[PDB]
Enzyme design. Structure first.
Site, PDB file in Angstrom:
ATOM      1  N   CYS B  46       0.854  -1.239   0.117  1.00 29.26           N
ATOM      2  CA  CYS B  46       0.102   0.014   0.130  1.00 29.26           C
ATOM      3  C   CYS B  46       0.764   1.165  -0.159  1.00 29.26           C
ATOM      4  O   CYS B  46       2.110   1.318   0.488  1.00 29.26           O
ATOM      5  CB  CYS B  46      -0.870  -0.147   1.037  1.00 29.26           C
ATOM      6  SG  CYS B  46      -1.987   1.416   1.588  1.00 29.26           S
ATOM      7  N   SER B  48       0.778   3.568   1.794  1.00 31.24           N
ATOM      8  CA  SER B  48       1.150   4.194   3.142  1.00 31.24           C
ATOM      9  C   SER B  48       2.430   3.527   3.656  1.00 31.24           C
ATOM     10  O   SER B  48       2.997   4.024   4.538  1.00 31.24           O
ATOM     11  CB  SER B  48      -0.140   3.713   3.999  1.00 31.24           C
ATOM     12  OG  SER B  48      -1.301   4.441   3.734  1.00 31.24           O
ATOM     13  N   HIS B  51       4.905   5.595   2.415  1.00 36.06           N
ATOM     14  CA  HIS B  51       5.070   6.680   3.210  1.00 36.06           C
ATOM     15  C   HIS B  51       5.766   6.652   4.481  1.00 36.06           C
ATOM     16  O   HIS B  51       6.463   7.482   4.924  1.00 36.06           O
ATOM     17  CB  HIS B  51       3.518   7.174   3.554  1.00 36.06           C
ATOM     18  CG  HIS B  51       2.861   7.525   2.426  1.00 36.06           C
ATOM     19  ND1 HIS B  51       3.260   8.318   1.174  1.00 36.06           N
ATOM     20  CD2 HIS B  51       1.392   8.053   2.530  1.00 36.06           C
ATOM     21  CE1 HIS B  51       2.411   8.589   0.524  1.00 36.06           C
ATOM     22  NE2 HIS B  51       1.142   8.452   1.279  1.00 36.06           N
ATOM     23  N   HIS B  67       0.797  -3.608   6.472  1.00 35.13           N
ATOM     24  CA  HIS B  67      -0.643  -3.542   7.153  1.00 35.13           C
ATOM     25  C   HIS B  67      -1.615  -4.217   6.425  1.00 35.13           C
ATOM     26  O   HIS B  67      -2.839  -4.409   6.940  1.00 35.13           O
ATOM     27  CB  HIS B  67      -0.829  -2.112   7.692  1.00 35.13           C
ATOM     28  CG  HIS B  67      -1.130  -1.156   6.397  1.00 35.13           C
ATOM     29  ND1 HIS B  67       0.090  -0.680   5.671  1.00 35.13           N
ATOM     30  CD2 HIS B  67      -2.266  -0.624   5.625  1.00 35.13           C
ATOM     31  CE1 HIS B  67      -0.504   0.000   4.692  1.00 35.13           C
ATOM     32  NE2 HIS B  67      -1.826  -0.064   4.834  1.00 35.13           N
ATOM     33  N   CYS B 174      -6.804  -3.308   3.582  1.00 33.62           N
ATOM     34  CA  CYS B 174      -6.639  -1.919   3.372  1.00 33.62           C
ATOM     35  C   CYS B 174      -7.335  -1.054   2.297  1.00 33.62           C
ATOM     36  O   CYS B 174      -8.333  -0.541   2.417  1.00 33.62           O
ATOM     37  CB  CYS B 174      -5.309  -1.248   3.755  1.00 33.62           C
ATOM     38  SG  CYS B 174      -5.117   0.602   3.905  1.00 33.62           S
TER      39      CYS B 174
HETATM   40  N1  LIG Z   1      -7.589   7.011   4.231  1.00 32.45           N
HETATM   41  C1  LIG Z   1      -7.329   5.582   4.529  1.00 32.45           C
HETATM   42  O1  LIG Z   1      -7.652   4.952   5.345  1.00 32.45           O
HETATM   43  C2  LIG Z   1      -5.998   5.274   3.475  1.00 32.45           C
HETATM   44  C3  LIG Z   1      -5.255   6.233   2.908  1.00 32.45           C
HETATM   45  N2  LIG Z   1      -4.442   5.698   1.951  1.00 32.45           N
HETATM   46  C4  LIG Z   1      -3.555   6.747   1.186  1.00 32.45           C
HETATM   47  O2  LIG Z   1      -4.310   6.879  -0.053  1.00 32.45           O
HETATM   48  C5  LIG Z   1      -3.400   7.533  -1.108  1.00 32.45           C
HETATM   49  C6  LIG Z   1      -3.338   6.581  -2.583  1.00 32.45           C
HETATM   50  O3  LIG Z   1      -3.003   5.212  -1.987  1.00 32.45           O
HETATM   51  P1  LIG Z   1      -2.780   4.199  -3.154  1.00 32.45           P
HETATM   52  O4  LIG Z   1      -3.751   4.266  -4.212  1.00 32.45           O
HETATM   53  O5  LIG Z   1      -2.054   3.082  -2.520  1.00 32.45           O
HETATM   54  O6  LIG Z   1      -1.396   5.022  -3.873  1.00 32.45           O
HETATM   55  P2  LIG Z   1      -0.773   5.138  -5.351  1.00 32.45           P
HETATM   56  O7  LIG Z   1       0.640   5.850  -5.175  1.00 32.45           O
HETATM   57  O8  LIG Z   1      -0.822   3.772  -6.126  1.00 32.45           O
HETATM   58  O9  LIG Z   1      -1.810   5.856  -6.222  1.00 32.45           O
HETATM   59  C7  LIG Z   1      -1.649   7.448  -6.012  1.00 32.45           C
HETATM   60  C8  LIG Z   1      -2.051   7.835  -7.556  1.00 32.45           C
HETATM   61  O10 LIG Z   1      -1.774   9.374  -7.678  1.00 32.45           O
HETATM   62  C9  LIG Z   1      -1.152   9.723  -8.708  1.00 32.45           C
HETATM   63  N3  LIG Z   1      -0.615  11.317  -8.579  1.00 32.45           N
HETATM   64  C10 LIG Z   1       0.458  11.551  -7.695  1.00 32.45           C
HETATM   65  N4  LIG Z   1       0.424  12.717  -8.128  1.00 32.45           N
HETATM   66  C11 LIG Z   1      -0.567  13.380  -8.474  1.00 32.45           C
HETATM   67  C12 LIG Z   1      -0.935  14.631  -8.871  1.00 32.45           C
HETATM   68  N5  LIG Z   1      -0.416  15.842  -8.337  1.00 32.45           N
HETATM   69  N6  LIG Z   1      -2.436  15.021  -9.588  1.00 32.45           N
HETATM   70  C13 LIG Z   1      -2.690  13.711  -9.883  1.00 32.45           C
HETATM   71  N7  LIG Z   1      -2.375  12.530  -9.631  1.00 32.45           N
HETATM   72  C14 LIG Z   1      -1.142  12.305  -8.960  1.00 32.45           C
HETATM   73  C15 LIG Z   1      -0.317   8.760  -8.972  1.00 32.45           C
HETATM   74  O11 LIG Z   1       0.139   8.732 -10.482  1.00 32.45           O
HETATM   75  C16 LIG Z   1      -0.813   7.689  -8.898  1.00 32.45           C
HETATM   76  O12 LIG Z   1      -1.373   6.633  -9.527  1.00 32.45           O
HETATM   77  C17 LIG Z   1      -1.908   7.439  -0.372  1.00 32.45           C
HETATM   78  O13 LIG Z   1      -1.749   8.570   0.304  1.00 32.45           O
HETATM   79  C18 LIG Z   1      -2.446   6.508   0.882  1.00 32.45           C
HETATM   80  O14 LIG Z   1      -1.456   6.773   1.866  1.00 32.45           O
HETATM   81  C19 LIG Z   1      -4.195   4.455   1.531  1.00 32.45           C
HETATM   82  C20 LIG Z   1      -4.978   3.496   2.392  1.00 32.45           C
HETATM   83  C21 LIG Z   1      -5.756   4.067   3.540  1.00 32.45           C
HETATM   84  O1  LIG Z   2      -3.044   2.715   4.791  1.00 30.41           O
HETATM   85  C1  LIG Z   2      -3.270   2.277   6.100  1.00 30.41           C
HETATM   86  N1  LIG Z   2      -3.349   3.451   6.844  1.00 30.41           N
HETATM   87  C2  LIG Z   2      -3.398   4.767   6.684  1.00 30.41           C
HETATM   88  C3  LIG Z   2      -4.675   5.649   6.916  1.00 30.41           C
HETATM   89  C4  LIG Z   2      -4.576   7.059   6.853  1.00 30.41           C
HETATM   90  C5  LIG Z   2      -3.467   7.592   7.439  1.00 30.41           C
HETATM   91  C6  LIG Z   2      -2.086   6.739   7.476  1.00 30.41           C
HETATM   92  C7  LIG Z   2      -2.318   5.316   7.666  1.00 30.41           C
HETATM   93 ZN   LIG Z   3      -3.073   0.932   3.542  1.00 28.34          ZN
END
Ligand SMILES: NC(=O)C1=CN([C@@H]2O[C@H](COP(=O)(O)OP(=O)(O)OC[C@H]3O[C@@H](n4cnc5c(N)ncnc54)[C@H](O)[C@@H]3O)[C@@H](O)[C@H]2O)C=CC1
Ligand SMILES: O=CNC1CCCCC1
Ligand SMILES: [Zn+2]
Ligand SMILES: NC(=O)C1=CN([C@@H]2O[C@H](COP(=O)(O)OP(=O)(O)OC[C@H]3O[C@@H](n4cnc5c(N)ncnc54)[C@H](O)[C@@H]3O)[C@@H](O)[C@H]2O)C=CC1
Ligand SMILES: O=CNC1CCCCC1
Ligand SMILES: [Zn+2]
Ligand SMILES: [Zn+2]
Ligand SMILES: [Zn+2]
Lengths: 374, 374
Positions: B46, B48, B51, B67, B174
């Protein structure tokens, strides 16, 4: 005697920021198609009118301000179908055209015909109906109620009960409906919840009325003027806190008082710092915070988006979320059926000629709503 | 033959930010009361987890990250009632204690026992179950799935269907549930609506799946990597836009495409600028914008609160708003009944020993989800 003919009457003109209103004669043109000319009976002093004086809210000057009011239709232009001469009416600072995407949406109320997003200070047709000393004068939010007569577009006026007391129901045209709807319609306060209300003026007291009507168990009023606590408790606050009494930030105080954050918070002041504090003091996973206050022109707040990622909801609204032309007559009917009280908001009633004294009362902290009578 | 004993196994240890994981032997203590030791079968990568490597998401180091995973219970501590050895399980990065004010609230899911707000990198009891080179190692979000075995608190694990394919359902731990729930539960996307999804990684594709399940008429994917568009369209996007292709800001582009703003927008990247752009591109009177992406540690965004005052709603959520232990087994059941698909998210499979290659694939833009097999 006046229909179709230019009216000369008294109005309060704001020629320039940071000056008293000038009470003098103005020339009010007759209504054109789909316009309504109204003889003013009473108008409230809302903080948003003062924001025009102070530069907080930018709209073209010179201007006839005033937007919270009630009056009697003097004449109608060609094509008006919703009001007639002699009707009691409330002007609407948010129109309801009934035809745009927002008017057709079940929740939305910020009609696309509004003059707030890109203020022009005109009628819908782009022109003004006011002249003073031979100079054209701008309108304000399609209302302009600090005048013995005004002209408004039909989409910006609502017909109300012919038996309505206009010296009270003018508050339904802005401050009461804004605060009450912010609680009952926008936040959707729930039975048994804990609410925090920042700002205990006319709009904040109306939020408290709405939180109490929704069955909140605790309603915490927050204001730096402790003279505003007694009335807040009278209308439903269970406790009040003054931030200046504390060494710590008030968001941490409110979080501790609510055993981990409130259910609903309201920013009813218009300060960037209190918008962020009100958000922070609601519970991080399920709290809701509503911005009601008007921020100073063109200024951005700064906040940590983790406040939202944990689960908070942040929203704002104009006019309590109410579709204005549909809701104002119903709210007047509710008041006449005694569903809510307006007298607690009214601390001063003065002749229109005393408009500047009314504004002094607001700025000094001494009044909630002053009603000006014509 | 391992119950009650320390297990030596391989894990991916992160000793320092911005460095490759080190695949090496660790010691995993047996579970204490109300703890569960899990043999890991599959874990997804993921963003995250990345990160943590980049310092975007701060948690104590050295750490065993990971996770989003699925495995099989190896042993249980005293008092555990909700899983047994041999059960298939998914660890939960947001616990569900069932006893706090959030767990008891009908909408809330960010349980107060989480390790996200004030990270300690421990078990619930404040201690670690991992040793490496004789040194204690931190846990991550109460999960730590980049290890052949881990120990979790009972409130951070869900029992799932014994026939589940663990190399697919790990994503329900997740990224899938986060995106799907962000649309169906947090935003509550309505039939016939227009949605905009910023970021077309595994989580954004799952948002698109939820918008489609909700019956959205248009689903606009937004990504600066045009190689993401084909899969976005396969899972339900009706159109895709690359901000770099346009001379004007994408909020203006999206407002024009949607004839005045979208009904629902989602930020699923983790940038302050795109959080503000996503809010701005929703309709000003009734739009809803959900923050899903993780912002860089301790950084504030800047925004004009008039965006909210007109009527927008802004919210965020962890884990798609799902109460984790209640929801994960039901989502596995729905997957087994073919109610949603996970194969579109899985672009690469690798053995756990090639974890660093998996992170390289994510960072290069080439993968959606790489699943690591133990
Ligand atoms: N709120 C929650 O519970 C969760 C939050 N997250 C967060 O969600 C986000 C996405 O996670 P994933 O899909 O795994 O990541 P990922 O990196 O696979 O996808 C992110 C996408 O954003 C694109 N991108 C990057 N910069 C950009 C920009 N300026 N403008 C437009 N597109 C842009 C990328 O090309 C990529 O395809 C991460 O920040 C992650 O940490 C992930 C899982 C749980
Ligand atoms: O990807 C899993 N958990 C994340 C949820 C949003 C804050 C950082 C941790
Ligand atoms: Zn996650
Ligand atoms: N969203 C909408 O549709 C509407 C917005 N407004 C705006 O709502 C706001 C309140 O309007 P009123 O009640 O008429 O104003 P008001 O001036 O009567 O009340 C504001 C209160 O805030 C208190 N206050 C000022 N600074 C404070 C601080 N740092 N901390 C705590 N309290 C503080 C004041 O002591 C006062 O009691 C104004 O900004 C007004 O422009 C008003 C009506 C419609
Ligand atoms: O008080 C009446 N209208 C207000 C509504 C919020 C923005 C400024 C004007
Ligand atoms: Zn309209
Ligand atoms: Zn007002
Ligand atoms: Zn809990």
């Amino acid at each position: 005697s006046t229909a179709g003919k230019v009216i000369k009457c008294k109005a309060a003109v704001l020629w320039e920021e940071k000056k008293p209103f000038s009470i003098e004669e103005v020339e009010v043109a007759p209504p054109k198609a789909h316009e309504v000319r109204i003889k003013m009976v009473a108008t409230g002093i809302c903080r948003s009118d003062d924001h025009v004086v102070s530069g907080t809210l930018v709209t073209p000057l010179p201007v006839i301000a005033g937007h919270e009011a009630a009056g009697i239709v003097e004449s109608i232009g060609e094509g008006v179908t919703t009001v007639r001469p002699g009707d009691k009416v409330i002007p609407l600072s948010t129109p309801q055209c009934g035809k745009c995407r927002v008017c057709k949406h079940p929740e939305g109320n910020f009609c696309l015909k509004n003059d707030l997003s890109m203020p022009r200070g005109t009628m819908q047709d782009g022109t003004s109906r006011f002249t003073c000393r031979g100079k054209p004068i701008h309108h304000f939010l399609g209302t302009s109620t600090f005048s013995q007569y005004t002209v408004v577009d039909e989409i910006s006026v609502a017909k109300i009960d012919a038996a309505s007391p206009l010296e009270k129901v003018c508050l339904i045209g802005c401050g009461f409906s804004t605060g009450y709807g912010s609680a009952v319609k926008v936040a959707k306060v729930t039975q048994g919840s804990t609410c925090a209300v920042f700002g205990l003026g006319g709009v904040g007291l109306s939020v408290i009325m709405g939180c109490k009507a929704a069955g909140a168990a605790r309603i915490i009023g927050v204001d730096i003027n402790k003279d505003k606590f007694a009335k807040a408790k009278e209308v439903g606050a269970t406790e009040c806190v003054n931030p200046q009494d504390y060494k710590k930030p008030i968001q941490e105080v409110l979080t501790e008082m609510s055993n981990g954050g409130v259910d609903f918070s309201f920013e009813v002041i218009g300060r960037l710092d209190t918008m962020v504090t009100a958000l922070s003091c609601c519970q991080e996973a399920y709290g809701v915070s509503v911005i009601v206050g008007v921020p100073p022109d063109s200024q951005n707040l700064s906040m940590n988006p983790m406040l939202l990622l944990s689960g908070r909801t942040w929203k704002g609204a104009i006019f309590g979320g109410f579709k204005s032309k549909d809701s104002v007559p119903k709210l007047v009917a509710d008041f006449m059926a005694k569903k809510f009280a307006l007298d607690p908001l009214i601390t001063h009633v003065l002749p229109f000629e005393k408009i500047n004294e009314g504004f002094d009362l607001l700025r000094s902290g001494e009044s909630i709503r002053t009603i000006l009578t014509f």
